[PDB]
Ligand binder design. Structure first.
Ligand SMILES: [Cl-]
Ligand SMILES: [Cl-]
Ligand SMILES: [Cl-]
Ligand SMILES: [Cl-]
Ligand SMILES: [Cl-]
Ligand SMILES: [Cl-]
Ligand SMILES: [Cl-]
Ligand SMILES: [Cl-]
Ligand SMILES: [K+]
Ligand SMILES: [K+]
Ligand SMILES: [Mg+2]
Ligand SMILES: [Mg+2]
Ligand SMILES: [Mg+2]
Ligand SMILES: [Mg+2]
Ligand SMILES: [Mg+2]
Ligand SMILES: [Mg+2]
Ligand SMILES: [Mg+2]
Ligand SMILES: [Mg+2]
Ligand SMILES: [Mg+2]
Ligand SMILES: [Mg+2]
Ligand SMILES: [Mg+2]
Ligand SMILES: [Mg+2]
Ligand SMILES: [Mg+2]
Ligand SMILES: [Mg+2]
Ligand SMILES: [Mg+2]
Ligand SMILES: [Mg+2]
Ligand SMILES: [Mg+2]
Ligand SMILES: [Mg+2]
Ligand SMILES: [Mg+2]
Ligand SMILES: [Mg+2]
Ligand SMILES: [Mg+2]
Ligand SMILES: [Mg+2]
Ligand SMILES: [Mg+2]
Ligand SMILES: [Mg+2]
Ligand SMILES: [Mg+2]
Ligand SMILES: [Mg+2]
Ligand code: NA
Ligand code: NA
Ligand code: NA
Ligand code: NA
Ligand code: NA
Ligand code: NA
Ligand code: NA
Ligand code: NA
Ligand code: NA
Ligand code: NA
Ligand code: NA
Ligand code: NA
Ligand code: NA
Ligand code: NA
Ligand code: NA
Ligand code: NA
Ligand code: NA
Ligand code: NA
Ligand code: NA
Ligand code: NA
Ligand code: NA
Ligand code: NA
Ligand code: NA
Ligand code: NA
Ligand code: NA
Lengths: 149, 147, 115
RNA sequence: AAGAGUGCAAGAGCAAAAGAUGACUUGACAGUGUUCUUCCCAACGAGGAACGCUGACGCGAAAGCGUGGUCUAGCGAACC
RNA sequence: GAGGCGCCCAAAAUGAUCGGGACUCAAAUCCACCACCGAGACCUGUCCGUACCACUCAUACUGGUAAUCGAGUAGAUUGGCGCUCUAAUUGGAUGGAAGCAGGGGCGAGAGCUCCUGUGGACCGAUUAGUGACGAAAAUCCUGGCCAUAGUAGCAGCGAUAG
RNA sequence: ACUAUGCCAGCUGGUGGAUUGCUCGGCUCAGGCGCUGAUGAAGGACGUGCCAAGCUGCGAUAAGCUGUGGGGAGCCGCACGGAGGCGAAGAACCACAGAUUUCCGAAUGAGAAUCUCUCUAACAAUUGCUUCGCGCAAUGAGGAACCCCGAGAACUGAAACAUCUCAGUAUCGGGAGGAACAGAAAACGCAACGUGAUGUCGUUAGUAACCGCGAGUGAACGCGAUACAGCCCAAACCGAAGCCCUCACGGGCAAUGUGGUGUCAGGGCUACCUCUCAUCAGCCGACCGUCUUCACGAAGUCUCUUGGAAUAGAGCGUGAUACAGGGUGACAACCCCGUACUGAAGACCAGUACGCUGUGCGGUAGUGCCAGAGUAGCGGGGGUUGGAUAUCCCUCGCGAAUAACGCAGGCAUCGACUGCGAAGGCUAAACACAACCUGAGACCGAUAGUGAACAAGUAGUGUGAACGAACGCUGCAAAGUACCCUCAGAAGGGAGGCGAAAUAGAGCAUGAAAUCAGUUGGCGAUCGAGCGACAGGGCAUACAAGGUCCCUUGACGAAUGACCGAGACGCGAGUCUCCAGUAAGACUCACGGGAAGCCGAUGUUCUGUCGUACGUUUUGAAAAACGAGCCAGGGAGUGUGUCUGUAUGGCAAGUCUAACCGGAGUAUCCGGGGAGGCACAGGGAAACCGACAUGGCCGCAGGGCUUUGCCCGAGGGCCGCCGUCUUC
């Protein structure tokens, strides 16, 4: 039995005095009315903040952390380039929605437990260090090298 | 009402499995005498034409008593009759074929006909009650395997 | 409350085992399963890898999922496993149903609860 | 021993001083916090205060004092 | 000098009061005392609900605990009754369905059910659904109906008319 | 034993029309289809029948005339009467085509509330062609909404209000079609080595943008789909090679340019190379599919019982590519219509696709020959938009270039780069609506559902604009009550007849309550008012559906708990001790006896206790606060979108598909579809940068151990560390 199903006989359906449940006065005015006066609590404060750049000059990076690559090397071995006790993977082939992005960037969250040779457009400093410290290497794509200028 | 494909597909498989359990099938109310269910049959069943032929076959398979169960109609209580809903009858035997549904079996009391590729949960479990007494054609039985 | 007849059966069997063979884990798992689905365990492999030891059966009052890597050779008992989880676990170890766990070990000895 | 004085209400504080005189000096400094108040309990902004730190300074032999005026009034959102 | 009880001080409007009758070694007052009456409180038998405990899949049973559980407007929470039509499963009806009137039984209750009469063709139960789903009230809406009442009017006017 | 006027409850009969059952009507969804009119529509008026008031039909040829096809032995509309007629000379009825088709009406010779007038004469008015003559033509008005072009509020929201919002909504003016509008880039601008007419659907996204930067408002490109289709002028260069009317003669148009060429794949010209393909103008002209209509169409009308009637029960049979639905004297696959299968026709698709005839595509070099002006653009003032310095439009003023040029790419100018060619024009298909045809339904079921199941936009109200009801049911068959008596009587009554039933007798199925007549039980003319609850008496009661109940005795017996008697105490009322936790003690049970209006229960009344309705307003209600005469029926948390929780379920580092596509049992359902959304990493206004798959401690549950203490301890808790912003 629902709450609603139990209202018949109650007369006020949980509304308290029958003088409640009238128009918008019972809610302090329609929609966000009062957000600066009687109802100000827990509204964001009024005002204007910052600026936006045009949607068409914004670049979108496709990102992946080394952890995701590394946790998956064996399954990607069934697909991408095992060589050298080592693995070579072109990151553009791994990342979902790569083509829909301006560039592919490898980030540094988690561990690298294998020797990896990584090809991407960009690398965090931490992703470079982890992949090297694991005895691997980082290969900047041509587009990646263009980004240097 | 929306339903996830996976969840719906699971229920199809689950209803299929309920047809293989003779206790479930008898629980549902179907009348028949045999240990083994579902009834599987030669693909030549699909070449049958006359309804009476199907009768004889079903009688030979000890399964015809369900048709007897479904041969009676209830004239329903209430105003549905004013809308064309006067009658109803028990569900009896689902016939699952491969090429096309069986015109020979279709007019049997309470019978439904279906095909392995598109057979659905309602077919297998009318009113959501699992364990419908079913006959599969050999090819149907195999085709249903990947559903 | 619960609509899945198999979940209910599982829960009923977990209680019967706890009340007889004295396994308190099974009672503990029964009570968690009786709690709302929202609170049920969902555990990835990285978590099992971290806290499990061999010849101690991992018990998940919930479902095991497939993120992460499991090297350790362990028996994992759960209400359910994702397809991937069960595959990764069966390589290095064994994935098992709670119904089997109760059969092999009704006293619930040498188990570690993981969520 | 405090009735004087300490800018201004009232109440409070102060004597080798928090008062007076003389000299020097600009801490009435920039940055950023902790905490209390505002709003006892008990959520709520501006404002206020207490107490720190970082940096730079003043004075002092030095410890130290200086986060304006001994303390509680002297205050103002968004948009522009 | 002090104390107790009373007296004067003391006048209001329809009929005077201590609730009334009425009471004077009281049926008044003060000091004590004796026996009684008198709640749903308190004690006590049985039952019910709720919470908890043991056993259990489940108070579904069974057993146990509550001196330390049992009032409640607004409101929060949760089990259940009834109505329509759909579906599955399954029943009733011309050897008399539904409805209606009167009556018998069950349930704390929402309500369930039977008998008799009337009626003369449809009606349920369980499960899962569905929703134009439950009225004592809103100067609520529409229709019908009682009192009012055999009552007012059928006189009044410069045209009193037979 | 009496008692009237009355009170309460039943009974019989009314009144009333609820209830149940029934559905010739609604409501809603879906598929198909879709224009009419000066050749006078739509609408209206008035006619039209043997008798004809309403509705329908029709139009002085008037519920109809003719032809062809179908159909068939009956028929003369709804409409069951009296008379009479029609039909085998094939009627009725249905389809298609034709004939007739009064008056008013755009209403058109002129006038006029449907009539009239005259020169038997009129396309009135506006307009094109024009033999300049109304000679040939056009427009007008209607239509359920849909569509396009103009004019354009306010209540309201912002808790006031002015910009904003309601909203370019309501409403008004103009107009098209079966659809409309749009449409082959002076586009886009995931900036590209990219896309490639338009509309629509899904998404992009409540994103960008607007806004007392308040409340609110709110796209696009792209993507996935649906459907796909691309072309013609102006000019250059030609220059009468042309077009319209007419059978023809002949007339008219046209140098102010008809016609050829040509149209960013730039074209023309000149010189070449090459082709018959593109395009355009024509001719033919469908399949399938879909919608609707139609033909044919299997098998019991056997036995017994009940019944007025079998379509019921029991028994014995049958068909099924047909067990949808309906009818028939009650539950019908087999009695009748139909239904499955197969077949035929019409309509739409469509003058489309395919096919064909004619035409001829295209390439190179040269050539500043051509290429749409109050335009592009700028300024003043407004409106509109998300359009922000960057929407679209109006108005006043100003105002280019000429392809060697010009416009765009969301501020302006200059250069570069990329895209594109305005100021001329056409264009199928995919999409909107629902008049019309058909189908469908967890919709309503006669106070509902349309206002309308009925005479329904009827009756009726208003000067008018406009407003606007209620009314469904005899019976299987009318067998719809003959005859007789009564009566002023074609009334009504009595008697009688029919039928299973007349308490089915005409607004006639059922037939509630309020309530009325008569009557039964209880009370009753000396007595007091929330009308009752609970307990107990009296009187009343056919059966059924309830069977208990009384008395004596005895057993058990919780709390509680004595008399008398004896002893002692107190001025006294009285108390203490013992008899004694005894006798007694509610319920329950057993033996014996008894009750059948007896016990329960029901009606009424009496006695005791308690008690000034209900709901609402209120600190406080019996209130001299508000509401209702009574009864029945009706009468109030609903939908979409978005957001945030919760319970259950699937799948899980993922998850879900949307539009739409295919299949099919054709709205269900099966298979595709991941466009896109959320989640997977955050921080920062931005530029830009970019994180613990575990280092330490405590410790619940659980586990372990040699156990009352040690150990491991997910989750949890406290730290540490890491990413980013600000930061000497
Ligand atoms: Cl930005
Ligand atoms: Cl995890
Ligand atoms: Cl280990
Ligand atoms: Cl209950
Ligand atoms: Cl593009
Ligand atoms: Cl008892
Ligand atoms: Cl006894
Ligand atoms: Cl509600
Ligand atoms: K699984
Ligand atoms: K057009
Ligand atoms: Mg509010
Ligand atoms: Mg994508
Ligand atoms: Mg009913
Ligand atoms: Mg200060
Ligand atoms: Mg100070
Ligand atoms: Mg301001
Ligand atoms: Mg209570
Ligand atoms: Mg059932
Ligand atoms: Mg009420
Ligand atoms: Mg009334
Ligand atoms: Mg009177
Ligand atoms: Mg006179
Ligand atoms: Mg005229
Ligand atoms: Mg306002
Ligand atoms: Mg306003
Ligand atoms: Mg405001
Ligand atoms: Mg707007
Ligand atoms: Mg765009
Ligand atoms: Mg031409
Ligand atoms: Mg505007
Ligand atoms: Mg009506
Ligand atoms: Mg008027
Ligand atoms: Mg009647
Ligand atoms: Mg008397
Ligand atoms: Mg008051
Ligand atoms: Mg009602
Ligand atoms: Na509430
Ligand atoms: Na209210
Ligand atoms: Na508000
Ligand atoms: Na404010
Ligand atoms: Na793309
Ligand atoms: Na502050
Ligand atoms: Na309450
Ligand atoms: Na049409
Ligand atoms: Na007539
Ligand atoms: Na006509
Ligand atoms: Na004309
Ligand atoms: Na003329
Ligand atoms: Na307001
Ligand atoms: Na106002
Ligand atoms: Na504004
Ligand atoms: Na302008
Ligand atoms: Na552009
Ligand atoms: Na009616
Ligand atoms: Na009595
Ligand atoms: Na009130
Ligand atoms: Na009251
Ligand atoms: Na009062
Ligand atoms: Na009245
Ligand atoms: Na309602
Ligand atoms: Na996707």
């Amino acid at each position: 039995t629902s709450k609603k199903k139990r209202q018949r006989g109650s007369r006020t359906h949980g509304g308290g005095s029958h003088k409640n449940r009238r128009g918008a006065g019972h809610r302090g005015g329609r929609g966000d009315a009062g957000r600066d006066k009687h109802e100000f609590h827990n509204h964001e404060p009024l005002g204007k903040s910052g600026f936006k750049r045009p949607q068409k000059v914004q670049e979108e990076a496709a990102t992946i952390d080394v952890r995701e690559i590394d946790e998956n090397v064996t399954l990607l071995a069934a697909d991408d380039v095992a060589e050298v006790g080592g693995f070579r993977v072109d990151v553009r082939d791994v990342v979902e929605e790569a083509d829909d992005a301006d560039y592919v960037k490898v980030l540094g969250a988690g561990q690298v437990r294998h020797e990896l040779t990584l090809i991407a457009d960009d690398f965090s400093e931490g992703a470079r260090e982890k992949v090297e410290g694991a005895g691997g290497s980082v290969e900047l794509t041509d587009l990646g090298e263009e980004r240097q200028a | 009402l929306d339903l996830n494909d996976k969840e719906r597909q699971l229920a199809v498989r689950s209803a299929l499995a309920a047809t293989a359990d003779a206790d479930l099938v008898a629980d549902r109310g179907h009348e028949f005498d045999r240990d083994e269910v579902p009834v599987v049959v030669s693909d030549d069943f699909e070449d049958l034409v006359k309804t009476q032929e199907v009768v004889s076959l079903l009688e030979a398979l000890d399964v015809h008593a369900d048709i007897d169960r479904a041969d009676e109609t209830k004239i329903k209580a209430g105003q549905g009759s004013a809308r064309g809903r006067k009658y109803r009858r028990p569900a009896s035997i689902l016939f699952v074929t491969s090429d096309e549904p069986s015109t020979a079996a279709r007019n049997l009391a309470g019978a439904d006909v279906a095909t392995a590729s598109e057979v659905n949960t309602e077919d297998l479990a009318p009113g959501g009650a699992p364990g419908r007494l079913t006959v599969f054609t050999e090819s149907a039985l195999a085709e249903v395997a990947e559903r | 409350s619960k609509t899945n007849p198999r979940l209910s059966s599982l829960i009923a069997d977990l209680k019967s085992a706890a009340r007889s063979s004295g396994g308190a884990v099974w009672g503990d798992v029964a009570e968690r399963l009786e709690k709302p689905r929202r609170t049920h365990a969902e555990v990835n492999l990285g978590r099992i890898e971290r806290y499990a030891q061999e010849d101690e059966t991992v018990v998940v009052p919930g479902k095991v999922l497939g993120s992460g890597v499991l090297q350790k050779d362990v028996t994992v008992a759960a209400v359910d496993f994702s397809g991937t989880a069960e595959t990764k676990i069966d390589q290095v170890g064994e994935a098992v149903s709670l119904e089997q766990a109760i059969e092999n070990n009704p006293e619930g000895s040498h188990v570690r609860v993981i969520r």
